[PDB]
A paper describes a structure:
Propionyl-CoA carboxylase ([name]) and 3-methylcrotonyl-CoA carboxylase ([name]) are biotin-dependent carboxylases (BDCs) that catalyze the metabolism of odd-chain fatty acids, cholesterol, and specific amino acids. In contrast, [name] and [name] have their BC, CT, and BCCP domains divided into two chains: the α subunits contain the BC and BCCP domains, with an intermediate BC-CT interaction (BT) domain between them, while the β subunits solely consist of the CT domain. In humans, [name] and [name] catalyze the carboxylation of propionyl-CoA and 3-methylcrotonyl-CoA (MC-CoA), respectively. (**A, B**) The side view (left) and top view (right) of human [name] holoenzyme ([name]-apo) (**A**) and [name] holoenzyme ([name]-apo) (**B**). Both holoenzymes are dodecamers consisting of six α subunits and six β subunits.
Using the same batch of purified BDCs ([Fig figs1], H to K), we also determined the cryo-EM structures of human [name] and [name] holoenzymes in the acetyl-CoA-bound state (referred to as [name]-[name] and [name]-[name]) at resolutions of 3.38 Å and 2.85 Å, respectively ([Fig figs2], [Fig figs3], I to L, [Fig figs4], I to L, [Fig figs6] and [Fig figs7], [Table tbls1] and [Table tbls2]). The BC domains of one [name]α subunit in the [name]-[name] structure and three [name]α subunits in the [name]-[name] structure are not resolved. These domains were built into the structures based on the resolved BC domains in other α subunits ([Fig figs8], C and F). The [name]-[name] structure closely resembles the [name]-apo and the [name]-PCO structures. The acetyl-CoA in the [name]-[name] structure has a binding mode similar to the propionyl-CoA in the [name]-PCO structure ([Fig fig3]). The conformation of the acyl-CoA binding pocket in both structures is also highly similar ([Fig fig3]). In addition, the well resolved CoA groups of propionyl-CoA and acetyl-CoA bind at the same position in human [name] holoenzyme ([Fig fig3]). These findings indicate that propionyl-CoA and acetyl-CoA bind to [name] with a similar binding mode. Thus, the selectivity of [name] towards propionyl-CoA and acetyl-CoA is largely determined by the interactions between the acyl group and [name]. The longer acyl group in propionyl-CoA, in comparison to that in acetyl-CoA, may mediate a stronger hydrophobic interaction that stabilizes the α carbon of the acyl group at a proper position to react with the carboxylated biotin.
Author numbering:
A (entry chain J): 33 to 539
B (entry chain I): 547 to 728
C (entry chain L): 361 to 539
D (entry chain H): 33 to 180
E (entry chain G): 547 to 637
């Protein structure tokens, strides 16, 4: 047997991975293999595989047997491009020891993590694992620690995207907590530390696999997964589209792409969206879609914390991040869940030089013991902090309500904002007329007459604008034109801040 | 200038284009402003300026002047295109995506658009209907008011009302059934 | 309390404290005895994954001296969360009662020998070899195994020589904590 | 056998290294052992040994035999002071596989190299080796590269 | 200020002092300007200012005034000391 024959035989096995029968089962369950997923994700022919001939070195517990020698050791690693842009990937292969993590497994992933940080290219992981490989014991625990160290080091340096394409258990479930976005596949992917078998054995509770850690749970209730997609093919198609929004590294400006949508057009549809009656809700998404280039908007966590909307869009070719209230849900109030999603999004966009647009319509905070005992104070500070420390352009437009401390939390101008616009329907006050007048004229006669005078003078955006809180009051139809003008001149903005080892977020 | 971008040299686009119940084999290539498209062996030349932002896209297909509108697009290949007044649904996958997509399980969920539930806790202040009333898509059915806001609940189904489960003056929570359509 | 398990509330308090001390150059001492994470739907639906990442992040990004002593249990992913050496730690000591493993003998042996006869006999051999701090120490996970009575002396020695420690990290506008 | 007994037995073997008969030959040739050399070099009582319980993980060519399991894997590493000033040291032990370099051997030396660079303290090496440990093959070549 | 230096707490110096053909057991301790030295059981007190650069070192040993010269020193313990005019080699 020549060396070339041995090489060819290893190449053929590396492509089969766990073997054809395993691959057959992989398809029966409705899943693609790790290599098929990469072929879909990356530009055709752009993928270059690294370390395809690496095998484990563990000899204990029968691991020295030829039957266990799977080239690639359960991960496919390499580099490629999406639409001409460099990206690093890795994908875990469930058909080889269940996708469990070995020492060598982690080493290969770390290698990719180090090349991407050095050059400044994003890393996209496709995760699917049964947890640690117990045959090696403590070697796999060091594997996790090294991966975690790279994921922390890369934070704020390169984007880190993690798409879950199957179950994930043990220590593996923490890597999506360190990356920037986590995506899942409905009814296929899971995120949990221990399985239902442990829950039943430890405590007298009955739960199944989907209830414990299914995609629907994490995208609707726990707030862990940013979005779930119907199947593997649609998940990767949307991932390519998402990729096109982000810079390659934090040293780069927000990408600018060819755009055919005139930057100076008006949107007459905005003038009548906001009702004159204060108790009538409207859909904030109608405003967002009409302003953004070609009416394309990428919504994050559509089913979690619906009272606040965050997502990506482009204006005049440039990627921007959008944050705003949704008056349809809980009157547009802030609560614990909305502050968590908001602060996380704002901080990512600031780290990677993506401008922020804020659409404010917030009457205050969600009251009640459910929020008080939940630490609403500690959690609300997260969104205020995320805006206050931002150094990227911030353009705020107030569409209607801004009462109380929520005015400042939703990126008010006095938090180093660049511009602040009000629509004619905006009203900025410490509280509404009823509270303010009954408190001011407490115990006085003819309070209702005093309220009429108070409403005429203060129930409008003018007592704030004349003091410098608002830069202009614009016809809503011109909102897009005004924002476009600001974005194209604030893009060269640079500011300094006192040196600090690191930031200290309230948590 | 830090990270050179290299445009993939794609000479031919091999697509699997699914219409109503048929899947067609289409291969396209770009020659500038005109795409040469082979549709199941038929050669067509589609010339345009391809301004992708305009609501009205004017194309010339083998000398035939057409106006089309693209109403929606999805990353998964779904496109809604209005052609001669009628909206057609087309799912365009690449050859590779179409070949692998056959391995996906055809799971089907239930359409429960007749079951109208409260999206938000509060007190019911208006119901626009009684059983037998006609309902249009987008029609307001119930109004629930809390947090100094009136949350209007609309129907997602055309038909008539079968039962009204919550009346004005009643207090409802999140997920409670308000009205049931036929 | 709760067998020493990690949960949402403990991760929040821990991460906040660790981050402050790192920012103001205050060394960290860690006393590890953690069997894993608090199980149950109360924690799963509460975002235990998202919250546990807060404590791991706070330790991993630290640049101040970190001295860890393991007094007894360190099972599973909790080993690394509680400031393990591979997160740029300075020293890691074990007491003779420490045990470092992916899981306890019962889980590990029944999974390894799943469907086999005489599992209990195999468990006896497994416990004798792995139910101790040695398979981790011989691989470089632990720097020494010390008589507990000397713990103070060892820590004092490390603190007075790690105080001049300086490290570099790649430049970043700001950190991006998992939240 | 308790864990404390096993620990004490490993401590006693780590101090003997290659064994008393090897140590006897070490003196016959007119050489000190690796641990005796450190005791002379550093301030009395200042030396703290690291990773004394680390053993090789190579199982091939009979390396899995109990006769080959020498705690310390042929190097003594640690830190101390000379006249009150911090210094890091390591010393290669010729009595254990001839002082040959293994993967784990290099790893321990690299660990000292990294702590010394981070704090800013000199490193003094006492070298004595027969070269690469051929039983591991290419693992020892990576060891050299990391040290370099 | 970057690297604190900690003076070893050496209470006693245990020396093996080789002269011509004899090896003596000497234990010394410092009490400031005076060293208390036990030489094979004999107690001596050597008081001086210990200016180590001068060619002439004046010492007082149990009240006896001596002048000595240190001519050479080696790291290996070898010292050449002139005592009453004669140079003695001590290791
Ligand atoms: C406390 C901590 O954080 S450490 C957690 C430690 N994690 C683990 O060791 C794994 C967790 N538990 C399991 O093994 C579960 O079975 C999970 C998580 C892998 C999920 O199981 P499933 O998705 O149903 O996969 P399943 O176990 O059925 O797969 C079977 C195959 O995968 C492999 N496999 C399954 N579990 C493991 C494992 N833990 N380690 C190594 N290989 C495994 C087997 O070789 C088996 O081979 P087969 O093809 O002949 O069946
Ligand atoms: C091209 C390159 O750069 S790679 C260079 C490759 N060269 C080598 O491998 C080393 C050179 N050759 C040798 O091995 C020589 O014997 C040298 C350099 C080690 C010198 O040998 P000596 O100083 O006489 O030591 P010696 O070999 O007598 O030591 C004997 C013991 O050491 C050990 N030993 C000796 N050589 C080796 C070796 N190459 N690898 C591992 N262990 C060794 C043996 O276990 C032996 O055990 P014992 O106690 O039962 O005798
Ligand atoms: C009527 O009871 C007044 C409700 C308060 C209006 C809303 S609800 C939560 C916000 N907090 C606040 O003071 N105003 C807002
Ligand atoms: C018995 O039912 C086993 C209980 C699990 C032991 C503890 S409880 C939570 C930690 N997770 C884990 O896997 N082990 C720890």
């Amino acid at each position: 047997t020549s060396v070339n024959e041995r090489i060819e035989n290893k190449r053929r096995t590396a492509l089969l991975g766990g073997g054809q029968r395993r691959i057959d089962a992989q398809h029966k369950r409705g899943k693609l293999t790790a290599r098929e997923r990469i072929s879909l994700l990356l530009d055709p022919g752009s993928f270059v595989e690294s370390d395809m001939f690496v095998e484990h070195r563990c000899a204990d517990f029968g691991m020295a047997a030829d039957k266990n020698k799977f080239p690639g050791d359960s991960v496919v690693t390499g580099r490629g491009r999406i639409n001409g842009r460099l990206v690093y990937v890795f994908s875990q292969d469930f058909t080889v020891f269940g996708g469990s993590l070995s020492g060598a497994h982690a080493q290969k992933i770390c290698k990719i993590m180090d090349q991407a940080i050095t050059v400044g290219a994003p890393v996209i992981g496709l995760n699917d694992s049964g947890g640690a490989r117990i045959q090696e014991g403590v070697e796999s625990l060091a594997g996790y620690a090294d991966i975690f160290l790279r994921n922390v080091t890369a934070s704020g340096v390169i984007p880190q995207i993690s798409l879950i394409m199957g179950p994930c258990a043990g220590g593996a479930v923490y890597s999506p907590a360190l990356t920037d976005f986590t995506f899942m596949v409905k009814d296929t992917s899971y995120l949990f530390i221990t399985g239902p078998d442990v829950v039943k054995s430890v405590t007298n509770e009955d739960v199944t696999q989907e209830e414990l850690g299914g995609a629907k749970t994490h995208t609707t209730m726990s707030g862990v997964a940013h979005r779930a997609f119907e199947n593997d093919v649609d998940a990767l198609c949307n991932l390519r589209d998402f990729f096109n929004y982000l810079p390659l590294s934090s040293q780069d400006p927000a990408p600018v792409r060819e755009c055919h949508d005139p930057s100076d057009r008006l949107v007459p549809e905005l003038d009548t969206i906001v009702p004159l009656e204060s108790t009538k809700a409207y859909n904030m998404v109608d405003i967002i879609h009409s302003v953004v280039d070609e009416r394309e908007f990428f919504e994050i966590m559509p089913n979690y914390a619906k009272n606040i909307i965050v997502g990506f869009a482009r204006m005049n070719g440039r990627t921007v991040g959008i944050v705003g209230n949704q008056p349809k849900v809980a009157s547009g109030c802030l609560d614990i869940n909305s502050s968590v999603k908001g602060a996380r999004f704002v901080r990512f966009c600031d780290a990677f030089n993506i401008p922020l647009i804020t659409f404010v319509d917030v009457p205050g905070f969600l009251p009640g013991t459910a929020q008080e005992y939940g630490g609403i104070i500690r959690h609300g500070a997260k969104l205020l902090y995320a805006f206050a420390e931002a150094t990227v352009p911030k353009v705020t437009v107030i569409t209607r309500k801004a009462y109380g401390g929520a005015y400042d939390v939703m990126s008010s101008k006095h938090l180093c904002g660049d511009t602040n616009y009000a629509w004619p329907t905006a009203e900025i006050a410490v509280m509404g007329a009823k509270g303010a007048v009954e408190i001011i004229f407490k115990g006085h006669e003819n309070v209702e007459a005093a309220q009429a005078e108070y409403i005429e003078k203060f129930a409008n955006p003018f007592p704030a604008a004349v003091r410098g809180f608002v830069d202009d009051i614009i016809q809503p139809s011109s909102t897009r034109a005004r924002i476009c003008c600001d974005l194209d001149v604030l893009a060269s903005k640079k500011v300094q801040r006192p040196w600090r080892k690191h930031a200290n977020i309230p948590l | 200038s830090r990270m050179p971008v290299i445009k993939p040299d794609i000479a031919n686009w091999e697509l699997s284009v699914k219409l109503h119940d048929k899947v067609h084999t289409v291969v396209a290539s770009n020659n500038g402003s005109v795409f040469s498209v082979e549709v199941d062996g038929s050669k067509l030349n589609v010339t345009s300026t391809w301004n992708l932002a305009s609501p009205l896209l004017s194309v010339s297909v083998d000398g035939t002047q057409r106006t089309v509108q693209c109403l929606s697009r999805e990353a998964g290949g779904n496109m809604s295109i209005q052609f001669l007044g009628t909206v057609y649904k087309v799912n365009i996958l690449t050859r590779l995506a179409a070949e692998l997509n056959k391995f996906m399980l055809e799971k089907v969920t239930e359409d429960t658009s007749s079951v109208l539930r409260s999206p938000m806790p509060g007190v019911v202040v208006a119901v626009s209907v009684k059983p037998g009333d006609a309902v249009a898509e987008g029609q307001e059915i119930c109004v629930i008011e809390a947090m100094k806001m009136q949350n209007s609940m609309t129907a997602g189904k055309t038909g008539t009302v079968k039962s009204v489960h919550c009346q004005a003056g009643d207090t409802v929570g999140e997920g409670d059934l308000l009205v049931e359509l036929e």
